[PDB]
Amino acid sequence: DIQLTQSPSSLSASVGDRVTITCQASQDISNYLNWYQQRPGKAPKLLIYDASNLETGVPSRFSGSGSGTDFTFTISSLQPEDIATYYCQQYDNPPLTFGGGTKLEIKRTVAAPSVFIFPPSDEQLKSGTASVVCLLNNFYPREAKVQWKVDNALQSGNSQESVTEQDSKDSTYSLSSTLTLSKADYEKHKVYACEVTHQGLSSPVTKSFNRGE
Amino acid sequence: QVQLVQSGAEVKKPGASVKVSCKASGYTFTSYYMHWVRQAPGQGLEWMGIINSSGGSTSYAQKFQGRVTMTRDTSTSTVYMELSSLRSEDTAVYYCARPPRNYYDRSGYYQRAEYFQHWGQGTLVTVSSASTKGPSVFPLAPSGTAALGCLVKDYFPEPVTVSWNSGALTSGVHTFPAVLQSSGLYSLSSVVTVPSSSLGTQTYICNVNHKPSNTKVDKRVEPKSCHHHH
Amino acid sequence: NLCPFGEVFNATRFASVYAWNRKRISNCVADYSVLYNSASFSTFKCYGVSPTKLNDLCFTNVYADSFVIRGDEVRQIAPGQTGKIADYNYKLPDDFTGCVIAWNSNNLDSKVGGNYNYLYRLFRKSNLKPFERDISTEIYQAGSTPCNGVEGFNCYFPLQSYGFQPTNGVGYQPYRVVVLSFELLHAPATVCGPK
Ligand SMILES: *[C@@H]1O[C@H](CO)[C@@H](O[C@@H]2O[C@H](CO)[C@@H](O)[C@H](O)[C@H]2NC(C)=O)[C@H](O)[C@H]1NC(C)=O
């Protein structure tokens, strides 16, 4: 089985930069190498085929080079919708194998998140549980701290976070933090607050609400 | 248009078997080959085998050899792929992919051109003994620009599909990756930011669909008003 | 000779329930196996007889009723069931001898904007007797005030339209239904199985 090593495994660049990914083969595979672009949730998309030939519809900025065992894949000047995981695939010798992949991300200027809070809906409260949701919209860098304060006390172990993958238009991230209590525990307290700390915020920003109002 | 449409997402218990469909349309089905590729959550791609959609010839990778079966049906122009003695490491999205046609060389050599120009949507197959559960959809009502959304809670297995105004509303929409809770069930949230002015002018409905449970919900997100009593 | 079952099932267009279609199969030989072999049939129940024995049986006449209903109304095409389809549209007798077959028709009977060609009766002054057809459109009077051909308060047009969209749930998706009646009268057998 031919094994294709792809490098780097991860990489971050800025809009307009040149990007260069490499794929090295375990055996001589002629020029029978292909380069795919896979964005999250979607199927892979053929960009380059037979080492260097641009497939119809793919922009001029994508490039392929190489023969034998070392190959390179180049992005002329990176654009915001270029973030994906790229794969290299050989078909010189069965079975057809792919590389490990290269995750491509945008380096952007710092953007502060927009914080909103959602108290549990009455519809859900009637089912016996209460889910408070804190949302951080369109921020960068990815690292953000979300603290749940319940009557100024800090809950631990009852919430969970979820991050979108980087946006294809403004290169930002969004964060979900959901704290779920039982209704009985939920109505033991009065103040629910989401304190957010992020590099773009000069000071931690808190969004709160009073249960019952 | 060339169109490869795969069957719905599906769950099976370990030791069972799944038959995934792949329907081709927009070209003469028999003149091409079909390949099956597998992708586990968070991993790379893995080729499985090739089917001749005219003759029916089949060739597999050694890993799947014996337990995989690739079928063809020219009448409906659809390929099939079945995996048997399923287990947890077979949890993945399965794609059917069409590459272009093989040709003969000036020497008389048979050369392949196996680079997948067309792909299917992908079929998610989850292998575990947990029992199917449909979701419950709750509204996250809004409070410049206003944020609203829907909470799709306790459900199994993945995935759920969430649209807004039945695909009419798209920009500003963030559908978050589902998270396993201590329950063993998944939950998810789908949000969208709109102008505050529109909160009274437009109506917002989240269309949730989870067909492993045969569930479909069209949830109304009503703005929360504090001074509206009777 | 062979009885035209393909004409009944593989027909391009189907009828609405309130105007359900009826085909009479007479004087020919019927290969029932073609039917009880398809993986397309979502529903397949036979009263008073088994399909297994169908290919070796002889009948005076057979009736193939055809229509389209929504998904969770198919359980109403059975002896003794009530509901708007069973009450005001298509009714099966208690001593029914025959078969009910149904399959999902979302791929053809649903359109992007919704298919409103398929209709069904909602209101009726009385339940329908077995195998009774009613295609009237007189205004249903639900109050003490007569309507005189104009519908208003407590005055309604009797027929209602199915909203058939590919985006609807399994329960609201259109199903095509075929009902096979086997008449066993005291007469010559005209419809028989090959064996
Ligand atoms: C109605 O639908 C199709 C018309 O083509 C027929 O389906 C097939 O039946 C033949 C045997 O007669 C099989 O070889 C095919 O595999 C079947 N196709 C499918 C997709 O199942 C069907 O027999 C027709 N029959 C009637 C009574 O209308």
Residue numbers in the entry:
A (entry chain L): 1 to 213
B (entry chain H): 1 to 52, 52A, 53 to 82, 82A, 82B, 82C, 83 to 100, 100A, ...
C (entry chain A): 334 to 528
Tell me, in the authors' exact words, what the paper reports.
The antibody COVA1-16 was recently isolated from an individual recovering from COVID-19 and cross-neutralizes SARS-CoV-2 (half-maximal inhibitory concentration [IC50], 0.13 μg/mL) and SARS-CoV (IC50, 2.5 μg/mL) pseudovirus (Brouwer et al., 2020). COVA1-16 utilizes a long complementarity-determining region (CDR) H3 to target a highly conserved epitope and can cross-neutralize SARS-CoV. Although its epitope does not overlap with the ACE2 receptor binding site, COVA1-16 is able to compete with ACE2 for binding to the RBD.
Here we determined the crystal structure of COVA1-16 in complex with the SARS-CoV-2 RBD at 2.89-Å resolution to identify its binding site (epitope) and mechanism of cross-neutralization. The epitope of COVA1-16 overlaps extensively with that of CR3022 but also extends toward the periphery of the ACE2-binding site (Yuan et al., 2020b). COVA1-16 binding to the RBD is dominated by the heavy chain, which accounts for 81% of its total buried surface area (BSA; 673 Å2 of a total of 827 Å2). Most of the interactions are mediated by CDR H3, which contributes 72% (594 Å2) of the total BSA. CDR H3 forms a beta-hairpin with a type I beta-turn at its tip and is largely encoded by IGHD3-22 (from N98 to heavy chain variable domain (VH) Y100f; Figure S1C; Figure 3B). The positively charged guanidinium of VH R100b also interacts with the partial negative dipole at the C terminus of a short α helix in the RBD (residues Y365–Y369). The CDR H3 tip also interacts with the RBD through hydrophobic interactions between VH Y99 and the aliphatic portion of RBD K378 as well as a π-π interaction between VH Y100 and the RBD V382-S383 peptide backbone. CDR H3 forms an additional four H-bonds with the RBD, involving the side chains of VH R97 and Q101. CDR H1 and CDR L2 of COVA1-16 also interact with the RBD, but much less so compared with CDR H3.
